[model samples]
Target chain A: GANKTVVVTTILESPYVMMKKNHEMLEGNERYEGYCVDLAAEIAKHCGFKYKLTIVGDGKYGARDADTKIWNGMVGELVYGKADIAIAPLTITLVREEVIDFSKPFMSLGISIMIKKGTPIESAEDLSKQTEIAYGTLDSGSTKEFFRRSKIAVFDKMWTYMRSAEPSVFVRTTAEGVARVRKSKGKYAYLLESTMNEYIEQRKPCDTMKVGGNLDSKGYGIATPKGSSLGNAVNLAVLKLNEQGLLDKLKNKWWYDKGECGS
Target chain B: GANKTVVVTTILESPYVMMKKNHEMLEGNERYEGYCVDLAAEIAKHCGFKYKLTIVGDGKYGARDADTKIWNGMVGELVYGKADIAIAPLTITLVREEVIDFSKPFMSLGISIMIKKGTPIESAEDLSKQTEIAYGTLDSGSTKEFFRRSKIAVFDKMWTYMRSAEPSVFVRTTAEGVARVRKSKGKYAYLLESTMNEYIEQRKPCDTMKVGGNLDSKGYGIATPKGSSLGNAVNLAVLKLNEQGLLDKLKNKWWYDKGECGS
Candidate 1:
């Protein structure tokens, strides 16, 4: 893989990985643009490697099938030799860490709430105590898993409600979650990572606001298959970028510099 | 190793680790009290490990001697096998990472500025362009190394001034840095991690405040020597604590529940 183009598996999430408006006119990595795209380039340059970006075929952020015990999504790509590494807004979690190696987080974030402007909800505790504002998380991601496994009193109560809600509180994609919150007027709120919540809150329409402090703290990390040879070099590059403020710069460039909502 | 008491190395820092004020009354881990001390207990219970805490001998955050090629501080204890693991507010960095294993950050922090309440400086850029106020970071830590290695224009300029400052601006301890800022009557600013900066700001003589955004982003991790068998279990325990909101609770307990500065 040293002399070959490393295949990078990433998922599409606005402001992190997305296609350029005129994607058909571009080729290879040029067809994409966003924070992670820019970051992949820097990592490649610093680590002295060549690469190609491939969207994860399943559109999933890597989950395991409990029955078959098979991994899927970006993580599966690495585990199954379909990709060399994954560079996306993939979260660092203990379960994933056991199967793959994650660089120290490149960006810090936490589980947060995104609500349509004027929504009454201000905190998870508030949401948990009320029934008017419907809420849910993206399916097959850490956010859902957090609620599913949480033992905390409030969060466990929340998970119980979400699991039994009539309309199926889980969304297949973050976009769906955001759209639900927008279209449902003040009746819906989305539970997602702060990074994505903040990004969408700043986009066109600007009808949404990230309400409350994050519920939990974690971060997004670049990943390679367990024991991958490239892990060391890529991890070092991430630390270097962070120390130089380059990661912070990239975040500002994607999240704020191009922001649509007025400051 | 599993049946034996794990020798844990840590550093003394306010709110994270500190003496309980009652001298000669306690023994073993009972002698100290703070967030980390509390966390150490939680971690031990979850990981089912027996342990003993030992304060690092040199009082350094760990730096390799350029001439002798030896490490000093908590990191050194791990590298030299004097401790089985390190549970301190040790910043995770590329250089140290190469020699040890760090769990996913149990706490997130970044380098920030601590200024006397009336200090004029608000940002690194502000400090970099002016000469009236003196500023420096703790010697032999990530903050100083950040300035020493930065290539960004403003930080590079600040590093230039700090390396050659006439009064020898660097501080041997965080306490020394805070003292300089407080007594300098707004003539001094100290660059340190936001965690410590905020902690100090809340203490009596609340004469100082953490101003501006952090200069960079990173976190504090639990560390073990390279390839230590306990590394995996410890890392998992950290993630569990974070997901359960136990880490956030600890931060609030130590940083605000006990705050003397008041809101």
Candidate 2:
């Protein structure tokens, strides 16, 4: 069982996975650090596996091309047999579940609103009714898809506005979206997962704040290729870690204890 | 395929399932109402199933006897082939997952603190370090089981205190827990699901408030017997409803919009 090292595909999202400052000088897993990094270590230890962590190439979270029907991001790595597993802030979703397997959530989060401090916005309804302030989610992620596929009146109206907004409201990455919120004064808001929003709120400058309750509820699951033999062991490890409070400990270690912003 | 009427096992929980005021005057499904009742209607319509709603005979959520190795409550109904399905605030857990099938969460919630207004408790840590304010969860539910199984320092300390608390702090039902909180005059706190905690916060008297963040994250899933034929379609229907925002709408209709407390 310990014969081969597992190949793990994750992303470079802050607090979940990040390159250390001396990353160029470090080798292997030492080059990367964050919540997911720590989680990967625990999973590997518990599951009795050796592993190497690799960042996803496309930099996307993972989405299927409507025209090409091909997946991109860490999900692609697993689906295409490029990686043995994905241990990142990959969302557990319906479309993704059809082609891959995910462990029970190692962490839970939801779509949340991020705003520059003192912005007039308070809820999605407030954003839906105002045009003076523009809001959008990270491009090609679950939050964007949530709005795109929603049929509810408020969310449907929001999707229509975002799709047609001039200058394109969607951002290429979570950092770009947060930057827009920070730099746009009060004219822009970013809808991202609560975990990232909370992490960003605790960084230096600490100008952004998560406002209102989450728009939806979901969790981040460790993913594997469909029918992978490692699936059962990985799932059990996640549950054990959760029950033992290791996942919570890792979260606090990365998101709060190391936080630059004052409590 | 539609020949047999599905027997649905549920529980008598407010805002999920409850007897109508005119219940004695009504017959069949009209005798009951709530969020889960509406959900059952939507599911039946979408799945093209005729069904009857029956409350769990034991009035328990579900749990296994460590010595007897027998399951009780709605879970037992499904395992023993007494009911076709269970649709209530049933938590999806590893033990339950092994013997039954659960759809992706129809609703996400976590263990949370419920305090009578003016209580000084804000987080689990505060409760753990102090002894004047006694706290506990509904006996025999996931919230109670979470504490029994937790290895986190704060939660483990809490479980030790709760298990040994004089006068037996654990409650038989959520209502009983809430009642103890109200009558204890800030000397007692109830640890319950966030969904119920929030609902109670918005009820009459408004003497209770949900304090701090949730203790852990999980969800309520519609469960069926292992390999039940209806599992796949039911899972898809839940996803479809979530994407369509019907679940959120139903939550609002039951929790906030109809809230007895003033905004």
Candidate 3:
């Protein structure tokens, strides 16, 4: 069995990397499915590489703590040679780019504001100008970094609110913050990525609505460790998927066509 | 001066219809630039028609009052002959379709959960079973209506909880509910449309992310009241734009490329 397997590391974010419910009986790559699952198949087919899928132990999109400065999550796996490549819902940030190599972004996205109905909040500036309502972002994520590093006046004010909120407005999980938004009556707003926000807006009981518009533009990229031989081949594979519209097709297949996830 | 114009009714949702900050001296359609604004132009060019854009006086997306049985917003505008065509982020729901006519969907989306990064929630069942995180949905729109009539066990259970939640889990506007999510720390989750959720997820202070799969699926369409001749021309124009990929381009033009609001 001369199976040349390229160990791939990923995460469990929906539409990208997911553990199939029926995965119990499945084996190898068949145990998982999502946008990246199909993407991995495409890359393997195009690059002529055999691969084995492995989930990131940390269940994170990957972030470096400014304190410890230690890499974690899928990025860490790639840097330490725990995996040959990473295929997940990972954003391509400049800091991450320096530590590792990234293919051109496969998906373009931006930051956004999740608003309660009738809050009179329409922009990040509106939230910044008001004292009656509190707004914040998730901790240790790109959104937090965006506010911490921005010089924009409105952003500076927002950062001030989040960083200094009486109860520490920063949330540990997206679910936690969304919980805050739902129960606070009318005092909180959560900033998040546009793709996830749009997906929520169409669900049952649709109370929340995305107001204002996107705050910034960014993209999710397939990442690899610095100077790996598989880098160029995988990057070329991603390019082929992007060029041939396979990426878009995968998105529709996972996000739209067969998109309904539950009753 | 044969200045013939079709009065078009729209809303002030971002990337759809917005009050341009630079609207100072710009007149008529020139004063606004958004997805709908550009869409209106494309449709006009394709159909060879002249039109005047007017914001819906009621500022609603066309829902009827249960008590008064009165139609309001853009749908009302068309029904009452206040406008010739309605161009906005109006969903093509069954009830609305019965009262009005809609073109093929300009966009396809579904319902989703707005959550923070680390929440232990993934599906409607997970949300419905949890007692720590209180969740609810918007009072207006089809999302709420869907929950009210859902026979699915998970949704029915979710409906039971949402209908009886304390401190009023239901919100009147999307902005108000999102405000609650940001302030509640980690105790609330708001349900909303995927489009709006995704749009917000891309903005600044990105803290929220759409979690789980969509609760349901739907689309937003250009609507006309009952029947109108302009419907055909406008509908055909939408098809052409969609086929030619102009619809996708307009989304990027307004939602992504020219999306800068403030910091």
- Evaluate residue A128 in candidate 2 and report its C-alpha lDDT on the 0 to 100 scale: 96
lDDT of candidate 2? Answer: 0.88
| The best candidate in terms of lDDT | 1
Q: What is the TM-score of each predicted model, taking all chains together?
A: 0.95, 0.91, 0.49
Model 1 clash tally?
Answer: 0
Better of 2 and 3 by lDDT: 2
lDDT of 3 by residue, A14-61 (tens): 657778899899898898888888888998999888889998888766
**DockQ of prediction 2:** 0.47
Q: What DockQ would candidate 1 receive versus the native complex?
A: 0.70
Candidate 2: pairs in clash: none
In terms of DockQ, the best-performing candidate is 1
lDDT of each: 0.90, 0.88, 0.76
Q: How do the residues B1-263 of candidate 3 rate in per-residue lDDT, one tens digit apiece?
A: 55468899998876577778989977878999778888888888988989999988977777887899999988888888888888888876655766776765676566788876567788878999987888888886667877887766788899999888887889887777777777787688888888777766655556676888876545577888676877766666765565454676677666556433333
Tell me how each candidate scores on DockQ against the true complex. Answer: 0.70, 0.47, 0.01
Model 3 - which docking category?
Answer: incorrect
The sequence of per-residue lDDT tens digits that candidate 2 reaches over residues A1-263 is 33888999988888788899999998989999888898999999988999999988988777889999999988898999999999988888878887888887887888899999989999999999988899998888889989988877888999999999977999988889989999998999999999999889999788999999888777788999988989878877876787666777788888899787886
Q: Quick one: best TM-score, which candidate?
A: 1
